[PDB]
């Protein structure tokens, strides 16, 4: 099972917040540009066909057990030129309003709490060459899951992070049986200071710094039927905490945890590439990969299939994903479903994601 998992703060940032990418095995770093291209690769907002767009996404949790426990995302982008784009997003995980009814009197005034976690980020993407673009994103993260009691401090914990991303999209290149198009991208995410959940520097958690690299290829048939195959690789940029021992019995473990927790996040990024007694073969074990296929009909209907595979030693979150998309006039509707193939229960099992995006403004020609 899971051995020596990587411990990071605010793990809700790694959850796929849109149905389109979730239907593609939780990957978007090298897919076609879309309104949700902020969590995955802000650099391809400069390749958007529409001038601006606004999207709303809903990812419910524990659907059979309760309602209003969900991860919500609102994204807005607006590419002012054919080379630059401005984008902002708001991911929000909350349990909904919870009534703190202490006594049993029906009419007693009750305090309502809404434990929640949200991230507000804005990105600027600039198209350097006709096929390459880069982006920089600044994110504010706030964690407010704790509820105030006589002993518990419920002060929200906050942190800031920056993202550096790049997107490559080649021109339509003709082949023997079709005319394809190549895509690639990278996204270094959540680069920022440690988040102190208990407002103490001695107890700080690494931000979920993450590196996504990926490539995509589009099969174009009859200029109206498109099949897109994308592969994504993901690696956390957080050092792995020690397990058995690597210097009494508990003294060695305590010293190892002391050394692991006394690492800066900038230094932790480089310690991620290593910090293990194994070689390259055993450090490739920490690499998460995801494969996806997407068939497009008239650019208004999409069928999405994807496979996501984490290492069984780290998280062990592996599943198959199915997705569908419909565009009426300017409304695109995306739904996705997850089939888990892992020993550990996936909290998003038996859950249908919903995404709704509005496209308006001018149209930009694709190169």
């Amino acid at each position: 099972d899971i051995e020596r998992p990587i411990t990071t703060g605010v793990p809700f940032l790694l959850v796929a917040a849109d149905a389109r990418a979730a239907g593609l095995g939780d990957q978007g770093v090298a897919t076609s540009s879309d309104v949700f291209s902020q969590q995955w690769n802000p650099a391809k907002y400069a390749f958007a066909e529409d001038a601006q767009g606004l999207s709303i996404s809903y990812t419910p949790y524990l659907t059979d057990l309760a309602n209003d426990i969900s991860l919500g995302q609102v994204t807005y982008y607006n590419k002012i030129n054919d080379r630059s784009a401005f984008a902002g997003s708001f991911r929000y995980f909350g349990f909904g309003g919870i009534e703190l009814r202490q006594t049993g009197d029906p009419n007693e005034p009750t305090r309502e709490v809404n434990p929640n976690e949200f991230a507000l980020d804005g990105s600027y993407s600039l198209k350097l060459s006709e096929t390459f673009s880069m982006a920089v994103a600044a994110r504010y993260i706030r964690s407010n899951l704790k509820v105030a009691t006589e002993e518990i401090d419920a002060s929200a914990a906050g942190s800031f992070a920056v993202d550096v991303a790049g997107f490559y999209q080649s021109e339509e290149i003709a082949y023997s049986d079709f005319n394809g198009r190549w895509r690639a991208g990278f996204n270094i995410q959540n680069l920022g200071p440690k988040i102190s959940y208990d407002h103490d520097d001695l107890s700080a958690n690494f931000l979920p710094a993450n590196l996504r690299v990926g490539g995509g290829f589009d099969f174009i048939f009859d200029d109206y039927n498109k099949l897109g195959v994308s592969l994504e690789l993901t690696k956390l940029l957080v050092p792995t905490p020690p397990g058995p021992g690597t210097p009494s019995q508990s003294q060695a473990d305590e010293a190892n945890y002391k050394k692991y927790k006394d690492i800066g996040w900038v230094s932790g990024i480089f310690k991620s590439f290593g910090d293990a007694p194994g070689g390259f073969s055993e450090e490739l074990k920490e690499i998460t990969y995801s494969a996806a296929a997407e068939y497009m009909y008239q650019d208004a209907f999409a069928m999405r299939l994807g496979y996501y595979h984490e290492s069984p030693m780290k998280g062990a979150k592996q599943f198959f994903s199915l997705g569908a998309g419909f565009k009426y006039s300017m409304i695109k509707v995306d739904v996705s479903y997850l089939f888990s193939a892992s020993k550990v229960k996936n909290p998003l099992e038996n859950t249908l994601r919903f995404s709704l995006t509005f496209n308006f403004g001018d149209k930009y020609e694709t190169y």
């Binding site: 524990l62 057990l65 426990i69 349990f95 703190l100 009814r101 202490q102 509820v147 009691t149 909290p347």
Partner: protein
């Protein structure tokens, strides 16, 4: 009609008029922390349960078969 109250690590269920048949208390992970198939009361107190993990989901099966869901904070 249905009220759930937590005073000191104790959960009190108050379902006026209607009789509760079963109560299942879940931590917010899908994990069942407490289940009682034999409540049969209009008021029930979960005194043999204590977790301290803040947010809990109380699902109550009524005698009619209706299922009432309430989210609580385990003070």
């Amino acid at each position: 009609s249905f009220y759930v109250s937590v005073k000191d690590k104790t959960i009190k269920l108050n379902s006026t008029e209607d009789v509760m048949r079963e109560v299942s208390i879940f931590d917010i992970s899908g994990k069942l922390l407490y289940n009682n198939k034999k409540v049969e009361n209009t008021e029930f107190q979960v005194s043999n349960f204590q977790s301290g993990n803040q947010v809990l989901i109380v699902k109550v099966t009524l005698d009619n078969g209706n299922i009432i869901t309430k989210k609580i904070v385990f003070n």
